[PDB]
Design a protein around this motif. Structure first.
Motif, PDB file in Angstrom:
ATOM      1  N   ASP A 262      -3.947   4.838 -11.922  1.00  0.00           N
ATOM      2  CA  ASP A 262      -4.780   3.728 -11.484  1.00  0.00           C
ATOM      3  C   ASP A 262      -4.436   2.501 -12.311  1.00  0.00           C
ATOM      4  OD1 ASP A 262      -6.041   5.451  -9.703  1.00  0.00           O
ATOM      5  OD2 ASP A 262      -7.682   5.910 -11.089  1.00  0.00           O
TER       6      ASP A 262
ATOM      7  N   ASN B 159      -7.446   7.228  -4.332  1.00  0.00           N
ATOM      8  CA  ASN B 159      -6.716   7.425  -3.087  1.00  0.00           C
ATOM      9  C   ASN B 159      -6.688   6.145  -2.266  1.00  0.00           C
ATOM     10  OD1 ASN B 159      -6.551  10.400  -3.538  1.00  0.00           O
ATOM     11  ND2 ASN B 159      -8.768  10.280  -3.200  1.00  0.00           N
ATOM     12  N   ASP B 160      -6.826   5.002  -2.929  1.00  0.00           N
ATOM     13  CA  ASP B 160      -6.821   3.734  -2.214  1.00  0.00           C
ATOM     14  C   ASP B 160      -6.042   2.651  -2.951  1.00  0.00           C
ATOM     15  OD1 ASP B 160      -7.797   1.990  -0.032  1.00  0.00           O
ATOM     16  OD2 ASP B 160      -8.993   1.040  -1.613  1.00  0.00           O
TER      17      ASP B 160
ATOM     18  N   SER C  86       0.686   3.703  -3.218  1.00  0.00           N
ATOM     19  CA  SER C  86       0.081   4.997  -2.925  1.00  0.00           C
ATOM     20  C   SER C  86       0.823   6.101  -3.672  1.00  0.00           C
ATOM     21  CB  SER C  86       0.121   5.287  -1.422  1.00  0.00           C
ATOM     22  OG  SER C  86      -0.749   4.420  -0.712  1.00  0.00           O
TER      23      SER C  86
ATOM     24  N   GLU D  35       0.840  -1.194   0.000  1.00  0.00           N
ATOM     25  CA  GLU D  35       0.000   0.000   0.000  1.00  0.00           C
ATOM     26  C   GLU D  35       0.878   1.248   0.000  1.00  0.00           C
ATOM     27  OE1 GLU D  35      -2.797  -0.356   3.343  1.00  0.00           O
ATOM     28  OE2 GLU D  35      -4.117  -1.422   1.954  1.00  0.00           O
TER      29      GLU D  35
ATOM     30  N   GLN E 214      -6.417  -1.442  -3.619  1.00  0.00           N
ATOM     31  CA  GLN E 214      -7.283  -2.613  -3.509  1.00  0.00           C
ATOM     32  C   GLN E 214      -6.460  -3.902  -3.494  1.00  0.00           C
ATOM     33  OE1 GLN E 214     -10.954  -0.558  -6.174  1.00  0.00           O
ATOM     34  NE2 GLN E 214     -10.234  -2.643  -6.608  1.00  0.00           N
TER      35      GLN E 214
ATOM     36  N   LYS F  44      -3.495  -0.080  -7.380  1.00  0.00           N
ATOM     37  CA  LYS F  44      -3.836   1.297  -7.036  1.00  0.00           C
ATOM     38  C   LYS F  44      -5.089   1.768  -7.765  1.00  0.00           C
ATOM     39  CE  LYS F  44      -2.722   6.118  -7.715  1.00  0.00           C
ATOM     40  NZ  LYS F  44      -2.467   6.457  -6.286  1.00  0.00           N
TER      41      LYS F  44
END
Ligand SMILES: CC[C@H](C)[C@H](NC(=O)[C@@H](CC(=O)NC)Cc1ccc(OP(=O)(O)O)cc1)C(=O)N[C@@H](CC(N)=O)C(N)=O
Ligand SMILES: CC[C@H](C)[C@H](NC(=O)[C@@H](CC(=O)NC)Cc1ccc(OP(=O)(O)O)cc1)C(=O)N[C@@H](CC(N)=O)C(N)=O
Lengths: 101, 101
Positions: B26, B49-50, B21, B17, B52, B46
């Protein structure tokens, strides 16, 4: 952290031999995804004028091993064999391949 | 052939993460060896803002899959999902991380 220089995914066994044959030092290796055994990994290592192939074995829980000592990951198996021979006939220690820039 | 830039071996879920980040686009992803489930792989991707996380599942023969389509290797699973979304809530396509030189 950086990606591991030893994971080549699904490359043919012959391709691994072609690549490792060009490596200068014994122990140069790579982990590949077996084509003859889908879902299993194989370890190819250079030694002299040859390239040795090992099956990455799994125990009942999914731990990986070559002979006796097993690990929670391919990553740990690889690192363990950098200081403990992968071979029972010669002292061969895994070392990163000299990658082409 | 060159090693895959997406295989990070045994890195903590939190580390994946932390790394993803910082990625700008994406779909930036990595495959890691699960710490909570030794012997299993996890896919971290990515998105906004998260980050997965997906379990790389195996069928009875050892083939890999995320949802329905399965493959003979992680390599093929990854490549398939570069053009077919890994998500059922958003169109997220896997793309290599912008590696640090
Ligand atoms: C000479 C290298 C080593 C020492 C030796 N290797 C072996 O016995 C090889 C034999 C082989 O290549 N057959 C085609 C094991 C092996 C068998 C199949 C194979 O298929 P691919 O994934 O398509 O390449 C890869 C490696 C061995 O004794 N291996 C042990 C230990 C091990 N984990 O492989 C064994 N056979 O259990
Ligand atoms: C939001 C991402 C995706 C869409 C979603 N992910 C999930 O459901 C996650 C849930 C999770 O992280 N729990 C801690 C699956 C997941 C569960 C455990 C896990 O443990 P680590 O290896 O230690 O990181 C990693 C991922 C999902 O629906 N996954 C599907 C499909 C899949 N193959 O994961 C499923 N849960 O079967």
């Amino acid at each position: 952290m950086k990606p591991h220089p030893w994971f080549f995914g699904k490359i043919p066994r012959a391709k691994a031999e072609e690549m490792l044959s060009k490596q200068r030092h014994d122990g140069a290796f790579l982990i590949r995804e077996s084509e003859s055994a889908p879902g299993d990994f194989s370890l190819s290592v250079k030694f002299g004028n040859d390239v040795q192939h090992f099956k990455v074995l799994r125990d009942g829980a999914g731990k990986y091993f070559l002979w006796v000592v097993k690990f929670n990951s391919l990553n740990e198996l690889v690192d363990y064999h950098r200081s403990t021979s992968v071979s029972r006939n010669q002292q061969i220690f895994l070392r990163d391949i000299e990658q082409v820039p």
